[PDB]
Design a protein around this ligand. Structure first.
Ligand SMILES: [Zn+2]
Ligand SMILES: [Zn+2]
Lengths: 114, 116
């Protein structure tokens, strides 16, 4: 976990990766590797109820998992979701992560990490 | 319903009363008297669910003087405008959060006071 600490710092110190993606709490301590997003203790609990096929929730490790972190990001995922036509800013967590948009970014994050 | 029909259609014409307050569907036949708002058949059933302390529902076809005065005092756009300008407004409120909000309370009372 040393070699890998350094990398997460690079990624954390980047695009809105130090606020929780869902609720904006500072210094998110958790991630959804799936979307390269950084979340807080509480929101990780909530993510854990979505299913691993929709969200893979870790605490700040496999190489391909770091590559997903480099590939995705808080700002990047939000920017992406905001341009989809059936985007709804009032989605529940469930609707959001079960949406076309989310699936597409997952696929994107995998394709890039590979 | 002849006096009614007239005034009711006079009110339909006022801002945004031709679409459902909640979901936006065309030509809502139902109302929540509590807010002067117009709502579709489906959403009317939804409003019966909140409880008559949060939403009193009636039909365009189903009226009292006061019930009618409340329609004049509220309105879909008026209520939305009011809501958007309260400090705690959340446009992603669920139906229960919305109608249990302070903003909803305050608009109920604007409507009652204007009515009488
Ligand atoms: Zn959070
Ligand atoms: Zn409706």
């Amino acid at each position: 976990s040393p070699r890998t600490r350094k990398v997460l710092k690079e990624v954390r110190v980047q695009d809105e990766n130090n606020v929780c993606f869902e609720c904006g709490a500072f210094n998110p301590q958790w991630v959804s590797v799936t979307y390269g997003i950084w979340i807080c203790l509480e929101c990780s609990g909530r993510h854990r109820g979505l299913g691993v096929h929709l969200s893979f929730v870790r605490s700040v490790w496999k190489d391909i998992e770091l590559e997903k972190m480099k590939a995705g990001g808080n700002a990047k995922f939000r920017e992406f979701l905001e341009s989809q036509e059936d985007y709804d800013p009032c989605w529940s967590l469930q609707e959001k992560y079960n949406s076309r948009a989310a699936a597409l970014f997952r696929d994107k994050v995998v394709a890039l990490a590979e």
